[PDB]
Each structure stands twice: as C-alpha cells, then as structure tokens.
Design a protein around this ligand. Sequence first.
Ligand SMILES: OC[C@H]1O[C@H](O[C@@H]2[C@H](O)[C@@H](OC[C@H]3O[C@H](O)[C@@H](O)[C@@H](O)[C@@H]3O)O[C@H](CO)[C@H]2O)[C@@H](O)[C@@H](O)[C@@H]1O
Length: 362
Amino acid sequence: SLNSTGLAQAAINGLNARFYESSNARWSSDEPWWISGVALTMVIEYMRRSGSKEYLDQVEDVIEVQRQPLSWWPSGEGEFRADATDDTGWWALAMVRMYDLTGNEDYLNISIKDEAYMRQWWTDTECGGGLYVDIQDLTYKNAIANELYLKLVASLANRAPNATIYLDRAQQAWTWFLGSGMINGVNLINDGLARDSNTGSCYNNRLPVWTYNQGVILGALVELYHATKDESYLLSAQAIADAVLSPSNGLTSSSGVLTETCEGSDSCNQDQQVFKGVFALNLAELGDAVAGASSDPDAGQDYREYLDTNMQSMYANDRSEIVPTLFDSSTGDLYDVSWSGPFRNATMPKQASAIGLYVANI
Ligand SMILES: OC[C@H]1O[C@H](O[C@@H]2[C@H](O)[C@@H](OC[C@H]3O[C@H](O)[C@@H](O)[C@@H](O)[C@@H]3O)O[C@H](CO)[C@H]2O)[C@@H](O)[C@@H](O)[C@@H]1O
C-alpha cells in the first residue's frame, strides 16, 4: 500500500523545491557543507535503486561546482578535499555511488584522491591507529571519520585498480576500530576516543551513541565481505544492527521507531537531524547483503521489517506536503526530525534523512 519509490521521489522533489540553490549548485548554503554531500548520496542512491535518472543532470551540476577548491580550504585543492576528514569522507562515498550508478571512471578517481587525502592524518603514534577529524587541530580521533574512511578503503578494494593495497588498508582499519574500544558492551559505538593524560592510551569517551555511527560501519563491513566473502564481517555488522533494533538499548522506541537520542529533549542540531537516514540506508545495504549470502528466504527479514515499520510511521506522523501556487507548481513532501513525533518544521538535514529511509525501502 506504500510505494517507497514514489515517496522517495516526492521527498527528493520537496528537498529541491525548498532547499536546492541553482545559483550555487548546492542545497542550503546556511547548512553544513557536508550535509549537501549526504543529500547527493541519497539522490544518487534513489536513482541507483529505482533505475531512474531524473536528477542525473542536477547531480552532475552539484558535482562539478563542489569539485572546485573550497573557499574555506584552498590547500585541499578541490576534489572534495576539505578541512575535515569526515567532510571529505561523505563526498568520497557519494562518489563511490556516482561511480556505481554511471560507471564513469571520473567519479572513482575522486574517491581515490579522497582516500589518499584522508590517509594523510592516519597515525599509528596515537591510539595505535585511526585518523583525526579536525585537520587543523589534530585532537580528536572520533567514530564517524574512521567509519567513513573504513568504508572508503573497503569500497575501493572492490572497485579501484590496486585493490590489494586497499584491502590490506581496510582489513587493518577494521582491526583498529574493533580494538579501539569504541564498540561498547552492547555492541554500540560511542562518539569517539579520549586519550590518557599520563599513559597516552586511548579509551571510549562515553559520548552519546549516535545513529549514523551505527550505520556507516555496517556499509563498511558489507563491502569488507564482498571483497573477502568472509561472512564473519556480516555477523559483526548484524551484531551492531541487532543492538540498534533492541529497544532495551534506547535507539528503537516501544513502537519500533528509530529515535535519535536528542529527539526527546528536542535538541537535535543541524548535524543530528540527518543522522537517522544515513543509518537506514546503510541498514538496507546490510539486509541486501545478508539475504544474498544465505538461501533462507527470511534472511534479512528483520532489517527489512524495521525499515518498513519506520517508513509507515514517518509517512503517517512526520509528513507534510507543499502548497502549490498559480506560479509554483512544485509538488512533493516535507519531513521533520522525529520519525514518530509531529511535523513542525522542515530543514534540509531533516529532509535528507527522510529521503534516506524511503530509499532504504526501494
Ligand atoms: O567530560 C565530558 C566528557 O569528556 C571527555 O570527552 C572529550 C571529547 O570526547 C573529545 O572531543 C574533542 C574535543 O576537544 C576539545 O577539547 C573540546 O573543547 C571539544 O570542542 C572537542 O569536541 O575530546 C576529548 C578526547 O575524547 C575528551 O576529553 C570524555 O572522556 C568523558 O570524560 C566525558 O564524556
């Protein structure tokens, strides 16, 4: 009764009608630049899963303009190399998807440049590995920057020419992530690592458990399996996803609705408004991998059911439509942060996360 393809296209059109800036080939310049890359990922993935190409022209426009040297980080020399390794990671993975959609080697080359760039801040001398997120300061090895990097080298191991060096890098990277301690006692991932003032050893800093730090790692473990056929990577990804699905861990509501930790206090900032959809998309990649690796028809049924349960809740309770005019005949759908709570406002990060859930069900 619910077409995930029709509703994704409607949410994409709502994203464009309210937040796309033709003058700047970017969505919402008042919102973080990296969230435009998350948005590009969702539009690229919609097209990759629905066989459609309606936004291909728009996507290429964004790519060409955001390719250029960033005004706030000229030293990066463009090609999405920014002042933060996670900012670069989001665009790099969007280019892996651009390559998956079009087959154009140009986008794969961007991802290779981005990996070499991010690897510049991998050090074995602190925490025994991992990279920093703050390229200027180098004081925080967190979860998202390392998850993004891990999925980049894992992705290149399946696509890039010198796959071997990327497979060795991805295997050594997952090993570091596993032993870092960021995966806690319930198989969830806190925000990052803290470092001992005296001993220099690193530990889980017990900062909040964000939804997207439970998703990007799933995509990485999926790609790590497609490059090794070692189902052990899938089982690790299933442990993380299963913990997100358990309501005892606080991320899944009693209704079965994914709930960001900030939604209760209504303090979800521009970053946190987009987290959920990144997880959903990555969970759909896990569910797809689990069902293909096993003959059981029920393989990945829980992950599919979860995405379906969350999509109907976001549709019924979180949706709003745009008012068409005699001048603007633009149509689509708008969405708020709470996939169960009421629609009050729509922001571009909230919109990108909604698109991600619909695309996760295509
Ligand atoms: O005491 C509160 C928490 O303190 C530690 O958490 C921090 C942060 O996790 C981490 O983020 C880097 C941080 O650097 C600046 O000093 C700070 O001003 C901020 O802008 C920036 O995000 O810094 C260190 C490294 O993890 C760490 O001290 C936890 O260890 C824990 O004690 C508490 O949860």
